[PDB]
C-alpha cells in the first residue's frame, strides 16, 4: 500500500495560518510530484499548488500566490502546506495527492492527473473554540436498534465505530448536523437481532481529535 | 482559466443500464489532458480515467472514457450498485480544473422504512437537555417526511435530521430525525411519537413512547 498520511483536521480563527502534512512512501517521495487540492461546498475542488521534491520546485494557483507555501522534509518524506492570513471561505477539505507522471528528463508538468490521493485534513476557519462531544446511549426496546448520540463538540469531525471494529453491518454513522447553538451533533445506530442482546454487548467507540475526546459507552 | 462543466446534475439509472457523464471546457483541450476522478461518500477522489481515455490500474472495464475538442465524457457502460458516487472531470492541459461533479443515484425498488424512537439517556437529563431520536432505516426512495407530535401537539422548529449516503450494498438511505427540549418540558408532556410518511406506506406509521419503560 503505496500511501499518503496526512495531519489532523484543525480549528482555525480568521486571518490565522494553518499548515497541513503530507507523509510519502519515499519512491513517491523520489519521482513524482505531490499536489494539494482542496473542496469545500459551493466551489468543489480547488487546485491550489505543487511541489516537486526531487528538484524543490513549486507552482501555485494565482488564487493563492501569497497566502500559500509548500515544503517539503527530506529526512521523513513529509510535505508541508501552510496558508496563511486564513478567510472564512479556505475551510475545506485538503488533500494531497501524488501527481499521475513520474518525473522527466525536461520538466515540471506541475499540470497533471492524479494517481493517489491523501486521506482527507479539514481546516475549519471558525471563531468558535475547540470543543469535545458528549456520547450518550441509544437504548433499544425480531431485529432491535440501538446506538449513541455524540452531542455537542467542535469542529468537525468526529468518527465512530462499534466493538472496536467487531462490529459493522448495519452500522448508520449519521452526517454530523449543526446546531443553532452552534456546536455539532452526530448519530450512530446500528441494527441487530433481537436474540442478541442477550448474548452480545455493545460499545460505540467515539472519538473526536482536535479535542483529543475519546470515549467507549456501552448501550443496554 | 478552462471551466469545467458537467452536465447533468445527477443521473438516476438502474444497475446494468448505461450511465453516460459529459464534461464540456470552456475552450479547447487536448484528449492528453484529461482525467475523471470518482468520489464516494467521505473518501477521497480515486483517479478512473487519465488523458481522455486511459483507464488507471484497477479500474473496471465497465468505465471508459471518449470526447476530444471541447466535449468529454465517461461511459459507466453498464452500472453496478457500488458505482453509487459523485464523479468529476479534470483539465490538466493548463492550470488544473475540475468540474462541480456528477452525482449518479442508483434506482431501486420501493423499500419502505423500518421506524425506531428513542427517547433521552438519563445521563443527558442528569444534564439539562432532552434529545429524542426517530431512526428511518433503509428506505427507497430518499423523499421522506418526519414529523414529531408531543401529546398529539405538533411540533415545529425544534427538529434536526441528517441522511446517510446511498448505501452501495442495498441502495437504500437511513436518515436520524431528532426533537430537541429542555429537560423542563421534557417532564412536562407524555406520548411523544414520531409519524413517518414515504412512498413505501400504505399510510403514515407512527412509533411513540411514555416516559415510562
Known amino acids: 500500500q503505496v500511501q499518503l498520511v496526512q495531519s489532523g483536521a484543525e480549528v482555525k480563527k480568521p486571518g490565522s495560518s494553518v499548515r497541513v502534512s503530507c507523509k510519502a512512501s519515499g519512491d513517491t517521495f523520489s519521482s513524482y510530484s505531490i499536489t494539494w487540492v482542496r473542496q469545500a461546498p459551493g466551489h468543489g475542488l480547488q487546485w491550489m499548488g505543487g511541489?516537486?521534491?526531487?528538484?524543490?520546485?513549486?507552482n501555485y494557483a494565482q488564487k493563492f500566490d501569497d497566502r500559500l507555501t509548500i515544503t517539503t522534509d527530506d529526512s521523513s518524506r513529509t510535505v508541508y502546506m501552510e496558508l496563511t492570513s486564513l478567510r472564512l471561505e479556505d475551510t475545506a477539505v485538503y488533500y494531497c495527492?501524488?501527481?499521475?507522471?513520474?518525473?522527466?528528463?525536461?520538466?515540471?508538468?506541475?499540470?497533471?492527473?492524479?494517481?493517489?490521493w491523501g486521506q482527507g485534513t479539514l481546516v475549519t476557519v471558525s471563531s468558535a473554540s475547540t470543543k469535545g462531544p458528549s456520547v450518550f446511549p441509544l437504548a433499544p426496546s425480531g431485529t432491535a436498534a440501538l446506538g449513541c448520540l455524540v452531542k455537542d463538540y467542535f469542529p468537525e469531525p468526529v468518527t465512530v465505530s462499534w466493538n472496536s471494529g467487531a462490529l459493522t453491518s448495519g452500522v448508520h454513522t449519521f452526517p454530523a448536523v449543526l446546531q443553532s447553538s452552534g456546536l455539532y451533533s452526530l448519530s450512530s445506530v446500528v441494527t441487530v437481532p433481537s436474540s442478541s442482546l442477550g448474548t452480545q454487548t455493545y460499545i460505540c467507540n467515539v472519538n473526536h481529535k482536535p479535542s483529543n475526546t475519546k470515549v467507549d459507552k456501552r448501550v443496554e | 482559466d478552462i471551466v469545467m462543466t458537467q452536465s447533468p446534475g445527477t443521473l438516476s439509472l438502474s444497475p446494468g443500464e448505461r450511465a453516460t457523464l459529459s464534461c464540456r471546457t470552456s475552450q479547447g483541450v487536448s484528449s492528453s489532458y484529461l482525467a475523471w476522478y470518482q468520489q464516494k461518500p467521505g473518501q477521497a477522489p480515486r483517479l478512473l480515467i487519465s488523458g481522455s481515455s486511459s483507464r488507471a490500474t484497477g479500474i473496471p472495464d465497465r468505465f471508459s472514457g471518449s470526447g476530444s475538442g471541447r466535449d468529454f465524457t465517461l461511459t459507466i457502460s453498464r452500472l453496478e450498485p457500488e458505482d453509487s458516487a459523485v464523479y468529476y472531470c479534470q483539465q490538466y492541459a493548463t492550470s488544473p480544473t475540475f468540474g462541480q461533479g456528477t452525482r449518479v443515484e442508483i434506482k431501486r425498488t420501493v423499500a419502505a422504512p423500518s421506524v425506531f424512537i428513542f427517547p433521552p439517556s438519563d445521563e443527558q437529563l442528569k444534564s439539562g437537555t432532552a434529545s429524542v431520536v426517530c431512526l428511518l432505516n433503509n428506505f427507497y426512495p430518499r423523499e421522506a417526511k418526519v414529523q414529531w407530535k408531543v401529546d398529539n401537539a405538533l411540533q415545529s422548529g425544534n427538529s434536526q435530521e441528517s441522511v446517510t449516503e446511498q448505501d452501495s450494498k442495498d441502495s437504500t438511505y437511513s436518515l436520524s430525525s431528532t426533537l430537541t427540549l429542555s429537560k423542563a418540558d421534557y417532564e412536562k408532556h407524555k406520548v411523544y411519537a414520531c409519524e413517518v410518511t414515504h412512498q413505501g406506506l400504505s399510510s403514515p406509521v407512527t412509533k411513540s413512547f411514555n416516559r415510562g419503560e
Open positions: 495527492a501524488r501527481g499521475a507522471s513520474k518525473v522527466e528528463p525536461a520538466a515540471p508538468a506541475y499540470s497533471d492527473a492524479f494517481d493517489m
Open positions: 511541489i516537486f521534491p526531487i528538484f524543490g520546485s513549486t
